[PDB]
Structure formats: structure tokens, C-alpha cells
Design a protein around this ligand. Sequence first.
Ligand SMILES: COc1ccc(S(N)(=O)=O)cc1
Ligand SMILES: COc1ccc(S(N)(=O)=O)cc1
Ligand SMILES: OC[C@H]1O[C@@H](O)[C@H](O)[C@@H](O)[C@@H]1O
Ligand SMILES: OC[C@H]1O[C@@H](O)[C@H](O)[C@@H](O)[C@@H]1O
Ligand SMILES: OC[C@H]1O[C@H](O)[C@H](O)[C@@H](O)[C@@H]1O
Ligand SMILES: [Zn+2]
Length: 257
Amino acid sequence: HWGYGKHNGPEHWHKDFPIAKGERQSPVDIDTHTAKYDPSLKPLSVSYDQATSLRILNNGHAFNVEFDDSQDKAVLKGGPLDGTYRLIQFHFHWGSLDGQGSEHTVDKKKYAAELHLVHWNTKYGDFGKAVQQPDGLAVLGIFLKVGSAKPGLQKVVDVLDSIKTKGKSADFTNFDPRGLLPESLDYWTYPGSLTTPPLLECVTWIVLKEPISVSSEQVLKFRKLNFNGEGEPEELMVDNWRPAQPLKNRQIKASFK
Ligand SMILES: COc1ccc(S(N)(=O)=O)cc1
Ligand SMILES: COc1ccc(S(N)(=O)=O)cc1
Ligand SMILES: OC[C@H]1O[C@@H](O)[C@H](O)[C@@H](O)[C@@H]1O
Ligand SMILES: OC[C@H]1O[C@@H](O)[C@H](O)[C@@H](O)[C@@H]1O
Ligand SMILES: OC[C@H]1O[C@H](O)[C@H](O)[C@@H](O)[C@@H]1O
Ligand SMILES: [Zn+2]
């Protein structure tokens, strides 16, 4: 099965997912000097006040905090997006050490971790149909750097001991994802893909420029999770990030002048 190790990591994925070498793969390095301000971008609207979180799951690659997406409870609109995109889940990618962990990089800088808030375009009815479309998904990416603690992350941190191994889940109701945002919504945007198999080229990426700060203790608890299932030899869930992929025939646009 695909993973992040030497024998099943990103350099192997193309053998079962040939789109891994495609024209629109993610993540990418964001060259800030090359990225151009785009006056055609509309204001970005993150509308999470009615979000309904349900559950947190260790899926063997990361942990997903899942939302009720049966209605427009928590949506992303505006910016580069045409129409309404509905929040389905968020997850993170992180490193074994503070100096790596993000998927996107900024002028080749790697952050300690990266948060992905995943949304699907409601014109396509369901996530499964959305991932058949070139504008099916919008992922809001947020970098994490290590410094002061992020208070709105602590509830996530504290439940991780209950989902240590692959396949474990726990109730995770009444979690407010607004507490994971930075102050500014300045962003870069480009067309890309899922960063894990099946690597589908369906994503409008919106990557915020301002990182959030989390404490060393918070990210250390991410690193206590396990890739393995219960009873199996312990493999710490660390370095679950894909490196930057070729930009090819793309441009990164900036929301800010
Ligand atoms: C059993 O060994 C493997 C190795 C690689 C992969 S892949 N292509 O990364 O999904 C799958 C299985
Ligand atoms: C299968 O669903 C997904 C959704 C999102 C992502 S990512 N890591 O945000 O690009 C990967 C896989
Ligand atoms: O409990 C987390 C969040 O859930 C939402 O459905 C509520 O409308 C918010 O007021 C609350 O902060
Ligand atoms: O032909 C000029 C155009 O080139 C494109 O590649 C850029 O995205 C536009 O911002 C520019 O106006
Ligand atoms: O908000 C997410 C979770 O945070 C804490 O774990 C609370 O104890 C729990 O009730 C809640 O579901
Ligand atoms: Zn991701």
C-alpha cells in the first residue's frame, strides 16, 4: 500500500497512480517573486460559523476531522472560486523535526506542518462526483510554524491519544475550525491536485500567506501518532508530506498587491 516510507513513499506512487507525473500535480514551491497579483480575484469568504464537526479518524496516513456536509453548514466562496464549496474534512501534514513537514514551500522554505481544509463544489452534488471534475475541490492550505501555542488547536491535540493507531476514530463534535485560521486571508492560488493517492487533478489550491503558530508541545503530540494499526510494531506517524512537484504550465496568482 502507498505510504511515506522508503519502499512505498512519494517516489513510488507513480507505479500505481500514473497521474503522479501529470501536468497539474501538487504541492508546488511558491516562488513569491514570480507570483503575480490578480485583480480579477474576488474577495475570499470563509464562512464557518455553522460548521458541524462529527468525528476524528486516524486513516493510517494522517488524521481527518470530519464535518457534516449534508447541507451548506461551512463553506468557502469567492477568491478564485466559481460558486460554493462545502467543507468535508481537515487534516495536517507534518515532519519528524521542526525544519520540515509542509507540502507547499515558500521560496523553497519548508514549514513545520501544513493544514488542509478540504471542500467540494456543490454543483457536483457529492465529493465522489466532484473528484471527476477539473474544478471539483478547493483546498485551503495554512502553514504551521513552531512558536506560541495555538489555543484553537488544543482540543485536536488532546484527543490524539484516543486515535493513536490506524483505523481508530473518536467523537469530535462541537469543534470550531475558525480557531485554526491566521488573522490575514492574503493568499496564493493555483490549479493542482490531491497530494495523496489517487492524486486527482481536481483542486483549486488557496494557500494562505500568514502561517499560524503552534507550540512545540502541540506538534510533538502529532508525532506520537502511529501509521500502524493496534498491536502492530510501532511506526511513528511523521514526515507524511509529499515534496514539491513540477510547476509545468501554471502560474501562481496572489490576492495581495
Ligand atoms: C507492496 O509494495 C508497494 C509499493 C509501492 C506501492 S505504491 N505505487 O506507492 O502504491 C504499493 C505497494
Ligand atoms: C481523498 O481525499 C483527499 C482530500 C484532500 C487531499 S489533500 N492532501 O488536501 O490534497 C488528499 C486526499
Ligand atoms: O461548536 C463549534 C461551533 O459550531 C457551530 O455550529 C456553531 O454555530 C458555532 O457557534 C460554534 O463555535
Ligand atoms: O498576455 C499577458 C498575460 O499573460 C498571462 O500569462 C498573465 O497571467 C496575465 O496576467 C497577462 O496579462
Ligand atoms: O470539540 C471537539 C472535542 O473537544 C474536546 O475533546 C471535548 O471534550 C469534546 O466534547 C469535543 O467533541
Ligand atoms: Zn493534505
